Structure 1
Amino acid sequence: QGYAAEISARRNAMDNASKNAGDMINRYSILYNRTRQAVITNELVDIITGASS
């Protein structure tokens, strides 16, 4: 009984763990995209400033 209960609880708990892992994957994808745009703009402005004198 304990062995079966342990296996079932493990199944549930790690399904929930995968849920939260996916949630973090989403939020970090969004944060990566924001940093991508920020980095591109920041790097580009250096070229602009160099060229503008």
Structure 2
Amino acid sequence: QGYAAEISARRNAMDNASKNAGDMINRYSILYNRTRQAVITNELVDIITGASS
């Protein structure tokens, strides 16, 4: 009775895990995207500063 409950619990738990991980994927995706824009901009600023001189 226990063993079935345990393996069942693992199924339930691992399902909830995937969901929690998905949320983190989305959160870090926004972070990635923001960071990506920032790199382009910050690099661009260095180039511009040089060109201006």
When the two structures are superposed, what TM-score results if normalisation uses the length of structure 2? Answer: 0.96
Structure 2, unmatched stretches of 5+, are: none
Deviations 1:3-38 (A, max 9, x none): 100011110011001000000001001100000001
The equivalent of 1:21 in structure 2 is 21
Aligned length: 53
Q: Which runs of 4+ in 1 moved over 2 A?
A: none
CA distance in 2, matches of 1:9, 1:49: 59
Percent identical pairs in the alignment equals 100
When the two structures are superposed, what TM-score results if normalisation uses the length of structure 1? Answer: 0.96
Structure 1, unmatched stretches of 5+, are: none
Superposed displacement of residue 48, structure 1: 0.3
